[PDB]
Amino acid sequence: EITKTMKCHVVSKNKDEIVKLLETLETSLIIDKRVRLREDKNMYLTLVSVVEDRESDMFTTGQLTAVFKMIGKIKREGPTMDKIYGNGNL
Amino acid sequence: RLAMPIRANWGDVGKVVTIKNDGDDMNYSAFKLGKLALLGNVKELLLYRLVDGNQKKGTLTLKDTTENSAKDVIKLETKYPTARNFNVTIKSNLVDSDKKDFIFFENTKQLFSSSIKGTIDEIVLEINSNLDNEYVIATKVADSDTILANVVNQALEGGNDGCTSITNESYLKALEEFERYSFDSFVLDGVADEALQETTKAWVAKNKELGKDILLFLGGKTEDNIKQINDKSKSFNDENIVNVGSSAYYENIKYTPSEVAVYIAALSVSKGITGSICNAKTIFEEVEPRLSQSEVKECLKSGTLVLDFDDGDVIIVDDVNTFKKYVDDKNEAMGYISNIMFINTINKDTSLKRKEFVGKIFNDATGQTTVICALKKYFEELMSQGIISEFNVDIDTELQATAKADEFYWKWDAVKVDVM
Amino acid sequence: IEEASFLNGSDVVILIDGVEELYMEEIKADFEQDEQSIKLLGCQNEISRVGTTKGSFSLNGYKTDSKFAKLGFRSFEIIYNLSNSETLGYESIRLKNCRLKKLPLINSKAGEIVKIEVEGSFRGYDLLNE
Amino acid sequence: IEEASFLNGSDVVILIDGVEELYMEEIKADFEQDEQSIKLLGCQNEISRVGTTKGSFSLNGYKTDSKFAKLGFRSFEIIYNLSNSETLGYESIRLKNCRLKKLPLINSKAGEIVKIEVEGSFRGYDLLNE
């Protein structure tokens, strides 16, 4: 399991635009509860929690804090029993 | 399920058909050897017909007389192809001119008798669907309501007899067709020609590589004495192949050992794994040549299934196979036909296990242990049922040491209950 | 490093008695059976058998209507679609002849949101998809 | 994104025996029934039936009078108006023949506020509104 608490900024001359952009981004992240890691649509980043702190600085800190997790699988395989054979005696 | 290659004029050519607990001529094996197959009381019999290539179907054409110029409206044919004189008499009905009597004859005895009105469809449906029309098929020419002509004893001809020429290719047709079917056993129809028996040996060997261990039965010719019978038995050494030794009587025929093999195969299939014919009574009234202890031992050791009238009824002295001339690694218990069929059944069940555990499982010690444990539990279940008395199923180390990643080998050995 | 997936519990879609129920929060259902342990007279390992089966289920969610109170002890069906979106192989299970063990008429605390808890039994189940 | 609603528990209004009771804090009530599980002689799925019903309820709230102590084991009615104000479709349930299981004469701790807890049973219920 790989977890990341990724923080996001939004900058603009119009602060109300910052509020609107953060609102739509949050709603998108929530209603679509995961994100395509790559265009192959193999992996996904299932959301855990998205939180905004409007008081936080626009540039240094960043308004929106999101936590994503992903579950890998150890890449190991082995030989397979395609064919089985045996005889009978007494 | 016994596959019988009937040398008969009756039955369908080139096709497999089954018959429930329900030919007739003594020359046709559908009744001469069909009776032998049925007397062993297999749950059902499956038939195949051997015929010369120069053999076709009989055809009779009939024409109307309602109009002045006669035209064909009905054509009649034998149910199966044949040249048999299946004669048909058609006359105008005594009361109504619109109804035509149809009297059918096997040769000349009255088989079916009825009259139907002038419409062709009713006549054809009657002639095809009535209970006594088992020996004819009738087909329409065209839609009509005219009235046939008067004809007596019209013989359907154009084909040939089913016993025209018993030859190697004609016999091999049966094996070629039976390749697409699986049976408990297959038998040869009396013809103790060693070429045919060797061809069937090769065919069954090919199936053994494929795994279809159809239990074969054969027999020597009427001209084989004890020496010839033993030599022919020694010629074969296969596990699933048998050579009945002595001729027999049931009603009237000196059935060859090969002809007797039909009833022997039926009994062997009927008995199943549970039943063994090593000391079982048989339907036959007598069998020759007779065998004393020395003759019995010589024939059994040579690989012959000995039948003797050693008591008030015929007795199969032992249920032995051509592998009774065994070799050192396999014990004499391998040489019993019931044991071989038992081995084949276990092979089929373990093949079901094989296709249960396909390569989804890894080729590691864990997967091998899983498969071996499944087989061990299967043999434990059989032992609980009582058939097995001991078992040891293990990794086939000799073949598994050189096994590639994809392939796995195993082997089983088990002791079985004896019957004296 | 090849991918994997956890079936997130927020993908559940429950259709109770046909109509889609959208306030349910957690659902549980198990197919019980009596073990029927038998001690043999010769073997020292106890043996278990299927016996007879019995269903049991439960649901919790935010109350928005008197649906369950008005439903009474009537029999009804439950569908449970555990959708998977990382891989599209959803899973659907049907519970047959669901009947409430106890009708939750009233349950509420002053300083909290009103939630409805249900529990009962079902005659049999069907695995429509997997 | 269309709206929804949670029935906040502070909207509950309980009229006990007609008079509006205004110190109650949490109320519970369920309509139990004996399952009467029957094992058929041919079918391996157990079957459940209504059997007979039994009521049970409870209330907790701040003590302000000896109302329940003086009431004794007399039968009485309870109304429960789970008002909804985001949507005006309130819900009202009536419990018939409520009887206390145990009279809570005294319950108090020195360093705490005195609360009264009640539990009992009711013969039947009516769903006046929903």
PDB file of N, CA and C in Angstrom, chain A residues 76-90, chain B residues 354 358-359 361-363 405-410 412-414:
ATOM      1  N   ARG A  76       5.654 -11.303  -9.180  1.00  0.00           N
ATOM      2  CA  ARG A  76       6.288 -12.612  -9.209  1.00  0.00           C
ATOM      3  C   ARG A  76       5.318 -13.647  -9.755  1.00  0.00           C
ATOM      4  N   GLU A  77       5.834 -14.480 -10.658  1.00  0.00           N
ATOM      5  CA  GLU A  77       5.082 -15.573 -11.257  1.00  0.00           C
ATOM      6  C   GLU A  77       5.931 -16.834 -11.157  1.00  0.00           C
ATOM      7  N   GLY A  78       5.419 -17.925 -11.719  1.00  0.00           N
ATOM      8  CA  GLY A  78       6.127 -19.180 -11.716  1.00  0.00           C
ATOM      9  C   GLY A  78       5.621 -20.119 -12.791  1.00  0.00           C
ATOM     10  N   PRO A  79       6.255 -21.282 -12.918  1.00  0.00           N
ATOM     11  CA  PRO A  79       5.820 -22.244 -13.933  1.00  0.00           C
ATOM     12  C   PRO A  79       4.443 -22.804 -13.609  1.00  0.00           C
ATOM     13  N   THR A  80       3.736 -23.214 -14.661  1.00  0.00           N
ATOM     14  CA  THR A  80       2.350 -23.653 -14.573  1.00  0.00           C
ATOM     15  C   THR A  80       2.221 -25.105 -15.014  1.00  0.00           C
ATOM     16  N   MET A  81       1.293 -25.824 -14.376  1.00  0.00           N
ATOM     17  CA  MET A  81       1.050 -27.237 -14.679  1.00  0.00           C
ATOM     18  C   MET A  81       0.045 -27.324 -15.823  1.00  0.00           C
ATOM     19  N   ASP A  82       0.544 -27.100 -17.037  1.00  0.00           N
ATOM     20  CA  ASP A  82      -0.320 -27.182 -18.207  1.00  0.00           C
ATOM     21  C   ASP A  82      -0.824 -28.602 -18.434  1.00  0.00           C
ATOM     22  N   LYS A  83       0.074 -29.586 -18.383  1.00  0.00           N
ATOM     23  CA  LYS A  83      -0.233 -30.974 -18.700  1.00  0.00           C
ATOM     24  C   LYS A  83       0.221 -31.878 -17.562  1.00  0.00           C
ATOM     25  N   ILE A  84      -0.624 -32.852 -17.222  1.00  0.00           N
ATOM     26  CA  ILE A  84      -0.354 -33.833 -16.177  1.00  0.00           C
ATOM     27  C   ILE A  84      -0.598 -35.210 -16.779  1.00  0.00           C
ATOM     28  N   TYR A  85       0.228 -36.190 -16.409  1.00  0.00           N
ATOM     29  CA  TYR A  85       0.153 -37.519 -17.004  1.00  0.00           C
ATOM     30  C   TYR A  85       0.550 -38.580 -15.990  1.00  0.00           C
ATOM     31  N   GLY A  86      -0.074 -39.751 -16.102  1.00  0.00           N
ATOM     32  CA  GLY A  86       0.273 -40.863 -15.240  1.00  0.00           C
ATOM     33  C   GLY A  86      -0.275 -42.172 -15.755  1.00  0.00           C
ATOM     34  N   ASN A  87       0.266 -43.259 -15.209  1.00  0.00           N
ATOM     35  CA  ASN A  87      -0.069 -44.622 -15.599  1.00  0.00           C
ATOM     36  C   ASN A  87      -0.590 -45.394 -14.395  1.00  0.00           C
ATOM     37  N   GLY A  88      -1.175 -46.554 -14.679  1.00  0.00           N
ATOM     38  CA  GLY A  88      -1.739 -47.413 -13.655  1.00  0.00           C
ATOM     39  C   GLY A  88      -1.135 -48.803 -13.702  1.00  0.00           C
ATOM     40  N   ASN A  89      -0.888 -49.363 -12.520  1.00  0.00           N
ATOM     41  CA  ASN A  89      -0.354 -50.712 -12.375  1.00  0.00           C
ATOM     42  C   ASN A  89      -1.117 -51.402 -11.251  1.00  0.00           C
ATOM     43  N   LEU A  90      -0.657 -52.593 -10.873  1.00  0.00           N
ATOM     44  CA  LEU A  90      -1.274 -53.359  -9.791  1.00  0.00           C
ATOM     45  C   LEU A  90      -0.215 -54.096  -8.976  1.00  0.00           C
TER      46      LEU A  90
ATOM     47  N   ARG B 354      -7.060 -34.518 -13.937  1.00  0.00           N
ATOM     48  CA  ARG B 354      -6.092 -33.750 -14.715  1.00  0.00           C
ATOM     49  C   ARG B 354      -6.708 -32.458 -15.232  1.00  0.00           C
ATOM     50  N   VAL B 358      -5.748 -27.854 -14.133  1.00  0.00           N
ATOM     51  CA  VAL B 358      -4.975 -27.280 -15.231  1.00  0.00           C
ATOM     52  C   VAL B 358      -4.113 -26.141 -14.700  1.00  0.00           C
ATOM     53  N   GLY B 359      -3.281 -25.568 -15.571  1.00  0.00           N
ATOM     54  CA  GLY B 359      -2.160 -24.722 -15.193  1.00  0.00           C
ATOM     55  C   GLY B 359      -2.421 -23.495 -14.337  1.00  0.00           C
ATOM     56  N   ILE B 361      -2.865 -23.783 -11.313  1.00  0.00           N
ATOM     57  CA  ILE B 361      -1.943 -24.152 -10.247  1.00  0.00           C
ATOM     58  C   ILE B 361      -0.517 -24.061 -10.774  1.00  0.00           C
ATOM     59  N   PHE B 362       0.397 -23.607  -9.922  1.00  0.00           N
ATOM     60  CA  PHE B 362       1.800 -23.504 -10.296  1.00  0.00           C
ATOM     61  C   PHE B 362       2.469 -24.874 -10.277  1.00  0.00           C
ATOM     62  N   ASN B 363       3.490 -25.024 -11.119  1.00  0.00           N
ATOM     63  CA  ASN B 363       4.293 -26.246 -11.165  1.00  0.00           C
ATOM     64  C   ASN B 363       5.403 -26.155 -10.119  1.00  0.00           C
ATOM     65  N   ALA B 405       8.959 -27.335 -17.445  1.00  0.00           N
ATOM     66  CA  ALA B 405       8.109 -26.543 -16.560  1.00  0.00           C
ATOM     67  C   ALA B 405       6.637 -26.898 -16.730  1.00  0.00           C
ATOM     68  N   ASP B 406       6.188 -27.074 -17.972  1.00  0.00           N
ATOM     69  CA  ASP B 406       4.769 -27.268 -18.242  1.00  0.00           C
ATOM     70  C   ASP B 406       4.264 -28.653 -17.860  1.00  0.00           C
ATOM     71  N   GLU B 407       5.123 -29.669 -17.874  1.00  0.00           N
ATOM     72  CA  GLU B 407       4.703 -31.059 -17.744  1.00  0.00           C
ATOM     73  C   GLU B 407       4.967 -31.586 -16.342  1.00  0.00           C
ATOM     74  N   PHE B 408       4.037 -32.409 -15.858  1.00  0.00           N
ATOM     75  CA  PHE B 408       4.148 -33.082 -14.574  1.00  0.00           C
ATOM     76  C   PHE B 408       3.734 -34.536 -14.747  1.00  0.00           C
ATOM     77  N   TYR B 409       4.437 -35.433 -14.055  1.00  0.00           N
ATOM     78  CA  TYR B 409       4.204 -36.867 -14.130  1.00  0.00           C
ATOM     79  C   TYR B 409       3.893 -37.434 -12.751  1.00  0.00           C
ATOM     80  N   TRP B 410       3.093 -38.497 -12.740  1.00  0.00           N
ATOM     81  CA  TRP B 410       2.728 -39.195 -11.516  1.00  0.00           C
ATOM     82  C   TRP B 410       2.398 -40.639 -11.876  1.00  0.00           C
ATOM     83  N   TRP B 412       0.313 -44.425 -10.104  1.00  0.00           N
ATOM     84  CA  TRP B 412      -0.456 -45.079  -9.056  1.00  0.00           C
ATOM     85  C   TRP B 412      -0.371 -46.590  -9.215  1.00  0.00           C
ATOM     86  N   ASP B 413      -0.370 -47.278  -8.077  1.00  0.00           N
ATOM     87  CA  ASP B 413      -0.393 -48.731  -8.020  1.00  0.00           C
ATOM     88  C   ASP B 413      -1.285 -49.141  -6.860  1.00  0.00           C
ATOM     89  N   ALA B 414      -2.106 -50.168  -7.072  1.00  0.00           N
ATOM     90  CA  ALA B 414      -3.055 -50.589  -6.053  1.00  0.00           C
ATOM     91  C   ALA B 414      -3.357 -52.073  -6.199  1.00  0.00           C
TER      92      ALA B 414
END
